[PDB]
Paper text:
Here we report crystal structures of one public and one private TCR (YLQ7 and RLQ3, respectively) from COVID-19 CPs in complex with HLA-A*02:01 and two S protein epitopes, corresponding to residues 269–277 (YLQPRTFLL; designated YLQ) and 1000–1008 (RLQSLQTYV; designated RLQ), that were found to elicit almost universal CD8+ T cell responses in HLA-A2*02:01+ CPs but not in healthy donors. Public TCRs are observed in multiple unrelated individuals, whereas private TCRs are distinct between individuals. For its part, the RLQ epitope, unlike YLQ, is conserved across human and zoonotic sarbecoviruses and is therefore a potential candidate for inclusion in a pan-sarbecovirus vaccine. The YLQ epitope has been identified as immunodominant in multiple independent studies, including one involving the BNT162b2 mRNA vaccine.
To assess ligand-induced conformational changes in the TCRs, we determined the structures of RLQ3 and YLQ7 in the unbound form to 1.88 and 2.35 Å resolution, respectively. Superposition of the VαVβ domains of unbound YLQ7 onto those in complex with YLQ–HLA-A2 revealed that conformational adjustments in CDR loops were restricted mainly to shifts in side-chain orientation that serve to maximize interactions with pMHC. Cα Met161 showed the largest individual displacement (10.6 Å in its α-carbon position). In bound YLQ7, β-strand D ends prematurely at Cα Leu159 compared to unbound YLQ7. Whether this structural rearrangement is a consequence of YLQ–HLA-A2 binding or simply reflects a degree of malleability in Cα is unclear (see Discussion).
Residue numbers in the entry:
A (entry chain A): 1 to 199
B (entry chain B): 2 to 241
Write the structure that this text describes.
């Protein structure tokens, strides 16, 4: 469809700050608009609707509909980890809802004391299979994927030791080779200069 | 309660038929079908009011067939499946214009049931260097070599499922990105304190639910039939 336009992002927003999601629509006869939240494994869930020009607050969400400029917006105050999701803009066209392609939102964790480090982990079963773990880096470290078909690298992923109130990022790399060492594993990426590489 | 859909997953050889079912919320006069692929929105397929199918999109081609016989449940039939029919098929019902979605049916159309594989699973034990440096311990699970890409990974500590300290990759990545029916890989981390890991009575399982062939699927190989099944791997704690 060409009546709901939104940029795919991903948008990165610091934890606590306001996230701003925008969407434009091609037909000024449209009157009824929606924001749907879809977590990565899940179905779209409705979080806000707006049927007249103006503002609307519900908790941390603010939806805004501007008919003169033909845009609709969703503001998320006090961004949390749980807001990381895809946010779908949607307009009613007669009796059917039409969806935009969705904007992906990453709420970046506020890492108190970064301690970037690459560790190697070995299989619980055959202790010749191993894995490299890049962890404890700050939230604006970008992990670069492999352009080496024999090397697999996963993107950033934040975990919460909720009991100890400690968040931490990490990425994982492994290889069909096993002479492959973790020193040269993440080198296709820009990593902190003082990343700890133990021996 | 809520909108229900079945099956949750379907693998089909290209050229075969397939039928999905939606059970909406009973009070809703309106029913919708949508198709959705990753990084894209739900694309409209058709719209029911009571039993009458009032609207079809060009995405609902001739091979596509949707009915809501009793103005209640709905079925969507794709005949002679193509690879480009692989998607999540969403159902939604409405009392007016707000739409309420079911959990979907994930369809994978493969050239040949023989390219379906269960994951292999391995658990990687916390590094001694991390333990000494941070007083914490990260376990890593790897699930590799599965096709199609519908798995559910979970961590189980002493027989109970844990969510705190867990990070799983949002998507499985392709093992052969230049192959149309590439097998996939998935990784997950679980971080516990060093002292919880050094306890030798603590048991750590990474479990991967894989959704594979059906009991009435034709299996013509000698390697085991990759049916729906759990694969898991385990590790016990160790006191330095």
């Amino acid at each position: 469809q060409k009546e709901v336009e939104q940029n795919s992002g991903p948008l990165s927003v610091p934890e606590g700050a306001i996230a701003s999601l925008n969407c434009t629509y091609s037909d000024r006869g449209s009157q009824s608009f929606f924001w749907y939240r879809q977590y990565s494994g899940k179905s779209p869930e409705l979080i806000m609707f707006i049927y007249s020009n103006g503002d609307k607050e519900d908790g941390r969400f603010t939806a805004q509909l501007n008919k003169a400029s033909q845009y609709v917006s969703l503001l998320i105050r006090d961004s949390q980890p749980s807001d990381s999701a895809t946010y779908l803009c949607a307009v009613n066209r007669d009796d059917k809802i039409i969806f935009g392609k969705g904007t992906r939102l990453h709420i970046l964790p506020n890492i108190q004391n970064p301690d970037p480090a690459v560790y190697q982990l070995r299989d619980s079963k055959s202790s010749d299979k191993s894995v490299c773990l890049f962890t404890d880096f700050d939230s604006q470290t970008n992990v670069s994927q492999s352009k080496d078909s024999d090397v697999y690298i996963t993107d950033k992923c934040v975990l919460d030791m909720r009991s100890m109130d400690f968040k931490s990022n990490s990425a994982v790399a492994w290889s069909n080779k096993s002479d492959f060492a973790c020193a040269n594993a993440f080198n296709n990426s820009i990593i902190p200069e003082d990343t700890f590489f133990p021996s | 309660t809520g909108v229900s859909q079945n099956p949750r997953h379907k693998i089909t050889k290209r050229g075969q038929n397939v039928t999905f079912r939606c059970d909406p919320i009973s009070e809703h006069n309106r029913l919708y079908w949508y198709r959705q692929t990753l990084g894209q929105g739900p694309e409209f397929l058709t719209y029911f009011q009571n039993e009458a199918q009032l609207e079809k999109s060009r995405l609902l081609s001739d091979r596509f067939s949707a009915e809501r016989p009793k103005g209640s449940f709905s079925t969507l039939e794709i005949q002679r499946t193509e690879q480009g029919d692989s998607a999540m098929y969403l159902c939604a019902s409405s009392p007016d214009i707000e739409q309420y979605f079911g959990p979907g049916t994930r369809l994978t159309v493969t050239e040949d049931l023989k390219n379906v594989f269960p994951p292999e699973v391995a658990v990687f034990e916390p590094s001694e260097a991390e333990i000494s440096h941070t007083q914490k311990a990260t376990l890593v699970c790897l699930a590799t070599g599965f096709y199609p890409d519908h798995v559910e990974l979970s961590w189980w500590v002493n027989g109970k499922e844990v969510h705190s300290g867990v990070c799983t990759d949002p998507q499985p990545l392709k093992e052969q990105p230049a192959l149309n029916d590439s097998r996939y890989a998935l990784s997950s981390r679980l971080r516990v304190s060093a002292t919880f890991w050094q306890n030798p009575r603590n048991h750590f399982r990474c479990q991967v639910q894989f959704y594979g062939l059906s009991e009435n699927d034709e299996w013509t190989q000698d390697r085991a039939k990759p049916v729906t099944q759990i694969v898991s791997a385990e590790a016990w704690g160790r006191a330095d």
